[PDB]
Design a protein around this ligand. Structure first.
Ligand SMILES: NC(=O)c1ccc[n+]([C@@H]2O[C@H](COP(=O)([O-])OP(=O)(O)OC[C@H]3O[C@@H](n4cnc5c(N)ncnc54)[C@H](OP(=O)(O)O)[C@@H]3O)[C@@H](O)[C@H]2O)c1
Ligand SMILES: NC(=O)c1ccc[n+]([C@@H]2O[C@H](COP(=O)([O-])OP(=O)(O)OC[C@H]3O[C@@H](n4cnc5c(N)ncnc54)[C@H](OP(=O)(O)O)[C@@H]3O)[C@@H](O)[C@H]2O)c1
Ligand SMILES: O=C1NC(=O)c2c1c1c3ccccc3[nH]c1c1[nH]c3ccccc3c21
Ligand SMILES: O=C1NC(=O)c2c1c1c3ccccc3[nH]c1c1[nH]c3ccccc3c21
Ligand SMILES: [Cl-]
Ligand SMILES: [Cl-]
Ligand SMILES: [Cl-]
Ligand SMILES: [Cl-]
Ligand SMILES: [Cl-]
Ligand SMILES: [Cl-]
Ligand SMILES: [Cl-]
Ligand code: NA
Ligand code: NA
Lengths: 277, 287
């Protein structure tokens, strides 16, 4: 068991501390196998690894600024949510004072800490990540995004956008399947059983199209934007017939229509990245 | 097993090829001659007329351009289809699936309607799905042979289900892919933490999609029960973080329409007093 300090005992902070304790680490906490101290100065002095999980980065700076001298030679893992610039500014300050800095984001809620298949994403000091990965595994599956401390904040936002696109298309499909009409009156649970299997194919599409974006070359092969637009129009008609009004078909047909007007009808879906950036 | 394929366009030709690769005695027919040469070289028996093809096998797999084409081909063969099983993988509307199923019933053919959830090059490969609805006897008796095309799923007894499932699953795909595109553009943009490649983002997104899948499985029973407990991720938190996504996307020049769609939808549910509920409550605000 390694020595680890947690700063912040809100619902998430308290969950982080409990996961470290459960893995057998010598856990000091500040806001019963944990050692609770009254001051953050005492908490920071107790451990070479300081895991921070406060409400805001403004709170981070209020807590950590008076401890600049006390942070020399320590490793700071900052799981507070906030902006990319705030992660970067905190990283630069930590470097100034000789603390190894790793910024991270928690891709679950407190009840998911310590459970399988939940991600915590980190960016910043590679030496901090490699040295602390074994202890950080107590919280969930750690991923090292790279060396730029601000990356984790951007990844969280982008990944939530992906989640909301998926879940909104799921809701649209649930409503289409549940509606009255031939082939309808299907439960959400039955639809989702098939959807679960289908997502493996959707994952093939995302892994096929990422190289297209990075190359700036978008070969349509057997599923061109012409075919997307045609079948999107079917989706729109079907949704109107069955009373599903989500705005997704209107968004899809407008976006693909602009690429087709521009002459890229034979390209893959990846071409559409040029029409949102 | 003896199987007939009617239709040798790109998809139908792929279906016949997959039946051949699984060892089935495969008979093929197409309206235009001269599209079965490669299949014949792979062991298919090509015949000149649809009547010969239907006569050749107890299982008749149909993959034509439209359901109008299906009826042009099958209607003269009503008496010849009695006692056979028709599996119709043609694309079209739920009503056309039902009308064809009713016609098959009248003439004594067991009818299974289906949809192919891949392109011709995906036929016969792992993970790709073929979805079927209609005669449970047809599905159970034919599943072993149909396995040659891809993983078969029996959606249930109503022939029109496959058509609706295809449309619904494509909507789910587009929602996912448009959220993925939005994320690629946000990750790739200039700014702190940015200039990340789409390939690097997608490697992380692949792992994240497992969690997203868990959300869908948690929320499906909410829809079916009409009870939407928000637990630790309520609509209040969705709306708050959606506003962050909208702000971030504007600063980095990502203009997809998705944040505005999300915040308007969640805002309507919060105004209605459902801020403590799960994402599943939003089904009531699109239906
Ligand atoms: N909760 C989740 O589901 C979840 C999921 C992913 C990420 N996160 C992130 O994890 C972080 C914390 O989670 P949380 O929601 O449990 O924390 P929180 O509820 O948002 O705020 C509670 C914690 O922040 C501390 N704090 C706030 N302002 C402070 C200040 N000026 N000085 C010292 N401490 C201060 C609180 O201490 P006091 O209030 O006692 O002063 C308490 O420890 C947040 O950034 C959140 O976005 C949370
Ligand atoms: N290709 C795909 O990626 C894909 C994916 C999923 C589902 N599907 C569905 O699978 C079906 C076939 O796909 P496909 O592209 O390979 O075929 P297709 O291009 O959609 O149409 C070609 C087939 O339809 C036949 N056909 C059309 N009109 C006919 C008529 N009046 N009488 C007799 N036969 C007629 C053609 O015979 P001729 O050669 O003589 O014209 C040929 O066998 C379609 O419903 C398609 O939507 C296709
Ligand atoms: O407050 C913010 N201002 C921002 O610009 C911003 C902010 C937050 C934020 C605030 C509280 C909790 C979690 C958070 N995530 C954030 C962001 N992610 C991004 C990705 C690209 C560009 C900008 C952002 C961005
Ligand atoms: O109403 C429709 N008219 C159509 O032509 C149609 C319709 C629906 C539909 C209506 C309500 C719910 C789910 C639905 N799926 C549909 C379709 N899928 C196709 C594939 C190829 C050609 C046409 C279609 C097609
Ligand atoms: Cl519903
Ligand atoms: Cl009905
Ligand atoms: Cl059902
Ligand atoms: Cl699955
Ligand atoms: Cl097309
Ligand atoms: Cl011939
Ligand atoms: Cl980009
Ligand atoms: Na962070
Ligand atoms: Na069909």
């Amino acid at each position: 068991g390694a020595k680890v300090t947690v700063l912040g005992l809100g619902p998430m902070g308290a969950a982080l501390a409990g996961a470290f304790l459960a893995a057998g680490h010598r856990t000091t906490v500040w806001n019963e196998g944990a050692t609770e101290v009254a001051s953050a100065a005492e908490a920071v002095a107790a451990s070479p690894l300081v895991v921070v999980c406060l409400a805001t980065y403004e709170a981070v700076h209020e807590v950590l600024d008076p401890l600049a001298d006390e942070l020399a030679g320590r490793t700071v893992v900052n799981l507070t949510s906030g902006s990319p610039v705030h992660a970067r500014e905190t990283a630069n300050w930590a470097q100034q004072h000789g603390a190894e800095y790793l910024d991270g984001v928690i891709m679950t809620t407190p009840s998911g800490i310590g459970k399988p298949d939940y991600l915590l994403l980190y960016s910043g000091s590679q030496a901090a990540f490699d040295g602390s990965r074994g202890t950080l595994c107590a919280l969930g599956e750690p991923m090292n995004l790279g060396t730029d401390a601000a990356m984790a904040s951007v990844y969280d936002t982008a990944l939530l956008g992906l989640m909301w696109g998926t879940l909104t298309g799921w809701l649209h499909g649930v409503a289409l399947m549940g509606a009255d009409g031939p082939g309808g009156n299907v439960t959400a649970t039955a639809f989702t059983e098939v959807a679960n299997r289908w997502m493996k194919t959707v994952g093939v599409f995302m892994n096929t199209y990422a190289p297209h974006v990075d190359a700036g070359h978008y070969p349509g092969d057997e599923f061109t934007l012409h075919l997307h637009h045609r079948t999107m129009n079917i989706l729109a008609h079907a949704s109107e017939l069955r009373g599903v009004v989500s705005g997704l078909p209107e968004l899809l047909t407008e976006l693909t229509g602009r690429a087709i007007t521009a002459g890229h009808g034979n390209d893959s879906y990846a071409r559409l990245v040029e029409f949102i950036r």
